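User: Last request for today: this protein with chloride ion, please.
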Amino acid sequence: LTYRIGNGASVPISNTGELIKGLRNYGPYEVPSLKYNQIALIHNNQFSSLINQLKSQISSKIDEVWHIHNINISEFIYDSPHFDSIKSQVDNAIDTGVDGIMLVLPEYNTPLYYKLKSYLINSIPSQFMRYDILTFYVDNLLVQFVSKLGGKPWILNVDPEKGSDIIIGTGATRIDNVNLFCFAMVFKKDGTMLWNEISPIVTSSEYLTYLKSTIKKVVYGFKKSNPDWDVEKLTLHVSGKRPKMKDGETKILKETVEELKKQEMVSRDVKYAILHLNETHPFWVMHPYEGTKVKLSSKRYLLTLLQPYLVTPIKPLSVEIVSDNWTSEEYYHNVHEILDEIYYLSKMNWRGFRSRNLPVTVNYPKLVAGIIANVNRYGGYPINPEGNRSLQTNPWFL
Ligand SMILES: [Cl-]
Ligand SMILES: [Cl-]
Ligand SMILES: [Cl-]
Ligand SMILES: [Cl-]
Ligand code: NI
Ligand code: NI
Ligand code: NI
Ligand code: NI
Ligand code: NI
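Assistant: Here's the final one, the structure of the complex with chloride ion:
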């Protein structure tokens, strides 16, 4: 129903004009805390007035829409559109002292893009742009960049009583027929990602081993940084193209929760549920058909999510409850609440102003996968969160 932005203001969902106007008037929910108040804009020798207009827009909107004041945007020039030339300027900018880097790259070199993407992600918050593609575009890229800098554009308005529930988005994505990586991301009910971990790429044979370890790792991260946050209610949203190990995976996830209760990481009497979330085949109804929940069986539901970016086109999301420790009496109420929360989470996407209409707990892992899959395909540097608090706690994948 509404997004909360700055100064206690909220705006209706589903209206980007109102959201941008809201941000102009009130600011984002949380302006990032910067160290240098300096951003590098890195580009080539060409298109002077295009880049000047771009720089002017970035500067204007960072100030007026995002309420980040007194930012210096410094410029760095690369001389040829090749890895070595661009990275030198990237390195020089890092050495000057910058909070992040906005990098403009040529249209037609996809392996280069992913090589640099992996370099930057491992180094410093960054925003990539392409010469060939303005106010709409710049608007959207700033939502991502502000988030990467640690800002919170807007959050979902949820009940304060549920303020401390956590949702873990977890599962794996296959890179190919044999290799995959697992993920585990901790979210607040308001849709903010607190912590993210990814396993190394491993074979399918190792999936369950690394699934448990990745979940345990993200919860460790989160608990070490939030030691007085009691996890009394926990939901797992499992997704991804992953080894079809039904009972086995559910056994291991159930064990993972039980083990965390032992590391005293969640409360000894946590109420939890483990849900499988899957996009199913689209359909077209020839705002009734929307936050609509369809029960298929005691354990299986569909949410009729609207197709994003404008018959009503539905992109249904299947929701199956595979395990929970609720009482049979609690089950009706909990079901309704979990489905409602999933619906709300479908309105959270800091990729841009327009809702993705897929729950953030499923979508953000998909974004991670697109990057990892392409870095691996194009022979970029592995995304390596090891020793990077910035990576584990910021949405680098937007
Ligand atoms: Cl130079
Ligand atoms: Cl330089
Ligand atoms: Cl980007
Ligand atoms: Cl993007
Ligand atoms: Ni100003
Ligand atoms: Ni250096
Ligand atoms: Ni308790
Ligand atoms: Ni399933
Ligand atoms: Ni409801």
